[PDB]
Amino acid sequence: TYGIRLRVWGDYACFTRPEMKVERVSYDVMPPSAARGILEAIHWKPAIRWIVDRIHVLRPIVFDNVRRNEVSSKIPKPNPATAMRDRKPLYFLVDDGSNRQQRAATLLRNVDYVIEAHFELTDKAGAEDNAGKHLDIFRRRARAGQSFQQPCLGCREFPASFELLEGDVPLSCYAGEKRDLGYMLLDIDFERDMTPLFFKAVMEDGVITPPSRTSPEVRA
Amino acid sequence: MTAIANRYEFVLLFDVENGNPNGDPDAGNMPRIDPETGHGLVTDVCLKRKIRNHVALTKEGAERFNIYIQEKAILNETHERAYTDAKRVTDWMCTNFYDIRTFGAVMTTEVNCGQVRGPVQMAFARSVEPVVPQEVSITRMAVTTKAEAEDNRTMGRKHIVPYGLYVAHGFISAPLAEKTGFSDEDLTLFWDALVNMFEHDRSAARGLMSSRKLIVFKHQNRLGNAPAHKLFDLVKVSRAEGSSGPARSFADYAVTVGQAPEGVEVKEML
Amino acid sequence: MTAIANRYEFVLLFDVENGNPNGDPDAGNMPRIDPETGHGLVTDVCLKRKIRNHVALTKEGAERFNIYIQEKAILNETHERAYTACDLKPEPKKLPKKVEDAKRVTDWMCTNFYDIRTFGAVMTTEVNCGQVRGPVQMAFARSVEPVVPQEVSITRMAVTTKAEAEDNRTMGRKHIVPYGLYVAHGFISAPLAEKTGFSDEDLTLFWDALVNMFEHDRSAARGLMSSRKLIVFKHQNRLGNAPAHKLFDLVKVSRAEGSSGPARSFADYAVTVGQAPEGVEVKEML
Amino acid sequence: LQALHGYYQRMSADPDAGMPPYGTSMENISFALVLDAKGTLRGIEDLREQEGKKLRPRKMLVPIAEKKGNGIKPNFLWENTSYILGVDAKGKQERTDKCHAAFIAHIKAADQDLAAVLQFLEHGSEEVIGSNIVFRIEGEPGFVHERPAARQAWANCLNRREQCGQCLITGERQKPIAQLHPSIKGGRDGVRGAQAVASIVSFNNTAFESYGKEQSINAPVSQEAAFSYVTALNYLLNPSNRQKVTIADATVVFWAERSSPAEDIFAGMFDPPRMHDLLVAIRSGKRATDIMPDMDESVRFHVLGLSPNAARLSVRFWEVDTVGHMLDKVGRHYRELEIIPQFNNEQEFPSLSTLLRQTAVLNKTENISPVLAGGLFRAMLTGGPYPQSLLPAVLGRIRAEHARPEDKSRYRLEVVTYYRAALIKAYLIRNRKLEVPVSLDPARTDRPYLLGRLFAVLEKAQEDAVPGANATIKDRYLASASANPGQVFHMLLKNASNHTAKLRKDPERKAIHYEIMMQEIIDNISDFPVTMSSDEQGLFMIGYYHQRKALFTKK
Amino acid sequence: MIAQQHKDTVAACEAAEAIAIAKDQVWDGEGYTKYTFDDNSVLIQSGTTQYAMDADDADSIKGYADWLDDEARSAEASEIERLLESV
Structure with missing residues (x-):
């Protein structure tokens, strides 16, 4: 009658645990927020809310380690007006000293899921x-x-x-x-x-049934 | 700020001959290889770095083609800003920073949930068949320090891939481009960079690397018209009839592209 | 020192006759081969070393033409020389804080050393001196046809130390390639030459070194090595006008129709150079 | 991880285990009142010890003392007699009464222990006066502040002393979130390779911050949970406890959900030195309970592997299978690794570190690729396929290695050692499903295996014809022979013909045996392949190893 | 090292905790709080007074022992021995 059933799969996946974000460690299964994001990538408007009902896991939990050269800090906000009060070359040197941060990631492989979600009208x-x-x-x-x-x-x-x-x-x-x-x-x-x-x-x-993220008894 | 009005998915084929396309920092600089399949691996950030370097070398501080995230190959001689509240600053960045306009960035204002995501996206590139990197031993005439001088030679090593053909997938999202200003001239420059990424990346470690094929799927709609994974399947790459044993040149591989769905075009920039 | 203003790609064809072009430290001293196919290999490092040797021989350590990787030099001492010339106090592991001072030291090293100016170098040692990429790069050299190295067993009528072994003479062995034609690819980058100072006189000296690379490299293990062909592709703008892989394909090497059996001389091969694109020219006069 | 937090919660309940309870410090304690559940004094124990020089108050782990000053600040459950007894040696009864009122108020921040101790305060040798005293309930070991209820009360008091969000380890709400975590040991008693102090969670750089959060608030954990898990990890990382092991650059720590004998053997299961009998049994497919009965195989076992970098350390792998399941998987791994040892001194059960070391550039602990190590001590205890990078690694080592008489080892080192052959056999058995014998199989009639045997016999002929040779064909032609048999076996056969011809004129005129072996092997081959695949190369190496071992002292 | 910028001021605590990696504490006779950073550098505070320590130089670790109270030194004998082998 209502609801949706979207299947998503790929060779790689990394749902980093918040406690191991710097040295990325992935969840065994996609969290409901990742399903929210995937669903919104297909269709979303300010007049709706996506709610995830269930997540089905269809492939074994297999991990893998990948290490990459990544940057230390975000680029800062400049003031455009002073950008040409003088010729100011704005740049970020990835290779300069502490700017280069190597971050190891342990990530999933050959994932496959089916997402059950439905709708809700907002204010x-x-x-x-x-x-x-x-x-x-x-x-x-x-x-x-x-x-x-x-x-x-x-x-x-x-x-x-x-x-x-x-x-x-x-x-x-x-x-x-x-x-x-x-x-x-x-x-x-x-x-x-x-x-x-x-x-x-x-x-x-093999199916995860998270509580609704809009309910008042799950929110503080 | 005109922006591209079509969704693009492109498949890029490149190969390396007696070189190290992407050393693994977690394996003593050996080329990355997939543990699950044994295929060689080349992370996407490497290709993005190559694209940034190529654009920086080509445009050389043009009006709207400055590059922010540089390495120490930066040039400090000339820069000029197009010059066209958080929204205003982000618009300026997108207007006169090519990589920000194309790949996105993060500008310290997380108060604005809407990030700078950028249209272009590309995943890891993996070899079409397993690669077997070779370990090459080398020597050096001179010792670096007096302490080791007290016989005055060093035995290094150098890892190479005898040959490997890598397939890189990528996605360009028109709706995201509409929020950044990624225009058609930017798309042409992007195709040019992909075609000529490696022509300026020569070094002692990489050997000879070049782009061989570049297939572009141009969707009719602002959104897509067919699944991307079904489009990437049309690009089938196999081994030529007369080739046996390990591959050692692009001639060993025969690549064919199928008939795309009715709603999408197909191009071959190479 | 005005840098060059054109991109160059070159292909070098050189021979070896009853010689050992490049030994393999792992497989005794056998010539390097691609074990899965049998084709011979010669590390680009070896060719760069021969070019350095020729430059040193033909310039005799003249000013602005010293070579950094010398026979017995200590690199830290050369970096200390650079720092003294720049009037700086060197921190052990770090470059000078003032970026202009670091640029000055690196520029001094590039200017007064030829091989740093050409091939680049890594100097981040216990007395840091920066890094250079080097406009001129060259890949491995690979034989057109599989090589067949053979072991030559030899003896000596003398013994180094006190030993009663000789009731037969002291043994030993060489490794030789009966014949092999190698193809070496290389690139020259104008954008890097701009940063490094690689000039046109440097380019002429480099071409001379490539042509006469082996003429002064004779030894008891090299046999007869010689450079046969040298095709140079010159682009008309700093960034090329055609992909390199397209250009290298114009140089086709195949065995002459009038020859049969294993190759044993350059006459067994026929080399043909095709037509270059409109934006490029071929200097097939070397 | 929640597993570490659970570990501390379990071990902390044991007073002698050495786990420091949260929010406690070492302080002087002199006397211990022993009272019944009804609050009636039952006795006093002089826990104070003797140095010979003086009788000092004992040092005990108790709730941290307050910042006392001119005013009265009550301590939780250990104080002088002015607070508890209702009397003081100084005779200031007003101060004593205020102290007692504050103390009785402090405790109230239905358990029988708390009620019993309160009842004692309702009542209010003589040497106890003036000294620091603590309580003790009859019929139970330990002290009141060591009881779980006292721990919860003190934790709640600290929480109210807040300076909180939902903890992601315990899942509780309205908890105070730790701005920074306690650090983790590094070096000799920490994750080997990391600097002196390291941390699981660190956000010192802006790129690691998300959603406007700052510092460690990006990973909200309750202060108690942070301290507990950090202390658990530090306790495991101490070599004094036998629950640690180091492989490649990663240090592995293991423990069980409850006390079990497995924690004392697993240190050797993947690092062999009764343990030998257990390994033999589990390899054969038996149950560990048979060798000794105390294992309850249903107890679940945790294995964690940390890899370091400059100042922060990263988790590399993590398994939570049951003791029985992972023991069975390790047994299967060792069964697959089984090969006839080359020399009697070699281990029957090769150590994982030794196996990995044999793939290193110069056979030393460094140069081991961390990724391969992660794929071992991973594929080992999960039963999954070995990483596809493994076989090319050992093949490349065989290509690069050679005889090393300069090692001062009497035997000229073999290029295809026992460990490399075992690794190749394991990879072929698991990842390729091929059948590989534990010893020589003369009926194999498999082309790569036959070529390996042929190479072995040619090598034997060579080292018989030229005794004390500096280098044999194993040093140079093994790689090309395995990879490209068609292009190199003609020269090997001609050289072996030369060797046998010399061997025939000289003593040992019947060379004839080697010729017969070459005939019997070449008979099953119709053509030398132009090229061979990686698994075929592995089969070639296994055949060469098997034939070589069966030829050392045939004659 | 920021202790030289802020000396014994309390704002040193704010700066360190803003930039410091995992913080430790000690409860042995006199309250001590440890702020550790990358580069094997640690800042230790107690009231207004504080001491800067380097984990790769022996002398810094000895001075850290000397700057502590006597009873604390006994409890830190284990930790002090750990850093001291850094050579």
């Missing part, structure tokens, strides 16, 4: 906006492969190949397991000053 929804219209727009885009931006498995260098599951969700690899993954990020509450909120993730039958 700034238009007088004519209806959940059905956005649902049909998303379904059409997913069927035709159109997307606002190419979805990625966490980091932009890991593109996601996505499809719409018209039929039944395929059987999972952990069909007979009840694996506890410990607390993991649910989403980030941007209303309460970007406050992260977590939930105890248990992978029953």
Whole structure:
């Protein structure tokens, strides 16, 4: 009747744990926030809210280590007016001293998921906006492969190949397991000053059922 | 600020002959190789660095083609700014910084959730078949310090890939470009850079590296018209009939492109 | 020292006859080969060393033409010389803080040393002196056809130390390639030459070194080595007008139709140079 | 990780384990009142010790003292008699009464221990007066402040003494978030390679900050949880405890969800020195319980691997399988590695570090590629495929290595050693599913295996024809022979013909045996392949190793 | 080292905690708080007074022992021995 079923897979994936962000360590499974981002990469408007209901894991948890040369700091805001009060060459030297930070990443491989999510109208929804219209727009885009931006498995260098599951969700690899993954990020509450909120993730039958991230009893 | 009105997916094929395309910092500088398949690996940031270097060398401080994230090959002789509140500063950056306009950046104002994401995106490039890097031992005439002078020679080593053909995928998102100003001339410059990335990257370690094929899928819609993964499948690369044993030249590989869906075009810049 | 203003690509063809072009430290002293195919290899480092030797021989340590990687020099001492010439106090592991002082020391090293000016160098030693990339780069040299190295066993009628081994003479062995034609590719970059000072006189000296690279490199293991062809592609602008791989394909090397059996002399090969694009010219006169 | 926090919570309950409870310090304690559950005094223990010089108050780990001054500041559960007893040696009864009132107020910040001790305060030898005293409940070891309830009360008091967000380790809300974590040991008793002080979490550079958060707030953990996990990791990293091991650049620490005998053997399971019997049993496929019964294989086992850099250290791998499952996987790994030892002095169960070291540039601990090490002590204890980079690594080492008589080792070092052959066999068995015998198989009739055996017999002929040779064909032609048999075997065969011809004129005229072996091997080959694949090269190396071992002292 | 810029001022605490990597504390007779940084440099504070220490030079570690109170030195005998082998 309602809801969606989007399947996403790729050779690489990295959902970095917040506690090991600097030396990237990925979650075993994509957190609901990553599913939010992937869904919004296909279709989103200010008049809607994406809610993730379930995440199905269809391939074994396989890890891998990749190390890269990365930058130490963000580029600072300049004042354009003074940019040519004199010829001021603005640049960032990646190779200069402490600017070069090497960061090792331990990331997943050959992932495959099916995302179940539905809709919700926000305060700034238009007088004519209806959940059905956005649902049909998303379904059409997913069927035709159109997307606002190419979805990625966490980091932009890991593109996601996505499809719409018209039929039944395929059987999972952990069909007979009840694996506890410990607390993991649910989403980030941007209303309460970007406050992260977590939930105890248990992978029953290979499907994770996070609590709704809009509910009041999960938010502080 | 006109911006491209089509979604692009491009597949770039490049190869290395007796060189190290991308040393692994976590393996003593051996070329990256995929543990799961044994294929050689070349991270995307390496290609992005090469593109930035090529554009910096080519435009040389043009009006709208300054490059922010440089290495110590920077040139400090001339710069001129187009000169066209957080929104205003970001617009200026995009207007007169090519890499920011193309790849994006982060400008210390996380108060603005909307980042500078940039249209262009590209993933890791992986060899079409497993590579077997060779270890080459070398010597040096002179010793660096008097302490080791007390026989005055050093035995280094140098890792090379005898040959490997790498496939790089990339995605350009028109809607993101519309928020940054990435225009069609920028797209032409990007194609040129991809074609001539390695022509200025020569060094003692990389050996000979060059771009062989560049297939571009031009979508009719502002969004896409067919799945990207189904388009990348049309580019099939296999081994020529008369070739056997390990590959050692591009002639060993035969590459063909299928018929694209009705809603997308196909180009071959090489 | 005005730098060059044109991109160059060159192809060098050189021979070896009953010689050892480049030994392999791992496989005894056998000539370097590509084990999966049998083709011979010669590290670009060896060719750069021969060029350095020729430059030193033909310039006899004249000013602005010293070579940095000398036979027995200590690099830290040369860096100390540079710092003294620049009137600075060298921190152990760090370059001078004032970026202009670091640029001055690196420029001094580039100017008064030819091989730093040409091939670049890494000087981040216990007395740091910066880095240089080097406008001139060259890749490995690979034989057109697989080589067949053979072991030559030899003896000596004398013994170094006190030993009663000789009831037979002291043994030893050489490794030789019966014949092999090698192809070496190389690049010259105007943008780097601008930063380093690689001039046109340096380019002429480099061409001379390539042509006469082996004429003064005779030894008991080299055999007869010689440079046969040297094709130079000159572009009309700092950035080339054609991809290098297109240009190198114009030089086609194949065995002459009138020859059969294993190659044993350059006459067994025929080299043809095609037509270069409109933006490039070929100096097939070397 | 939540596992480390759980480890501290489990070990901290054991007073003798050495875990320092959160928010506690070493302070002087003199007397211990022993009282019943009803608050009635039952006895006094002079816990103070004797140095011979003087009787000093004992040093005990107790809640940190307050910043005392002119005013009265009550300490939580250990104080002088002016607070507890209701009397003081100074005779100032007003100060004593105020101290007692503050103390009784402080404790109240339904457990039987707390109620019993309160009842004692309702009552209020003589040497106890004036000294620092602590409580002790009859019928239970330890002291009141060592009980879980006292720990929770003191933690809550500290939390109210806040300076908080939701902790991502315990999941509790309204907790104070640690601005900075406690540091982790580095060097001899820490992650070897890291500087003297390191940390799991660090955000000193702006590029690591996200969502406008600053410093360690990007990873919100309660102060207690931070301290607990850091202390657990530091305790594990101390070599005094036998729960640590170092492989390549990574240091591996292991523990179990509860006390188990596995923690004392796993230090040798992937680092062999009864343990030998256990290894033999698990390799054969038996259960470890058979060798000794105390293992409860259902207890789950944690293995963590940390790799260092300049000042911060990164997690490299992490497994949480049960003791039985991972023991079975290790047994399968060792079963796959099985090969006939080349010399009697070699280990029957090769150490993981030794195996990795044999792939190093000069067979020394450094130069080991960290990625390969991560793919070992990973593929080993997970049962997954070995990293595809493994086989090319050992093949390249065989290409680059050669006889090394300068090593002062009496035996001219073999290029294809026992360890490299074992690694190749393991890779072929797992990643390629091929069948590889543990010793020589004369009926194999497999072309790469036959070529390897042929190379071995040619080598034997060479070293018989030229005794005391500086170098044999193993040093130079092994790589090309394995990779390109068609282009190099003719010269090897001609050289072996020369060797046998000399061997025939000289003593040992019946050379004939080697010729017969060459006939019997060449018989099964119809053509020398122009090229061979990597797995075929591995088979060639295995065949060469097997034939060489079966030829040392045939005659 | 920022201790020279701010000397014994309390704002040194703010600066260090803003730039410092994981912080440690000691509760042995006299309260001590440790701010550790990269480059094996540690800043230690107690009240207004503070002492800067380098973890690669023996003399700095000895001075850190001398700057501490007597009873603290006994508890830090283990930690002090750890740094001292840095050679």
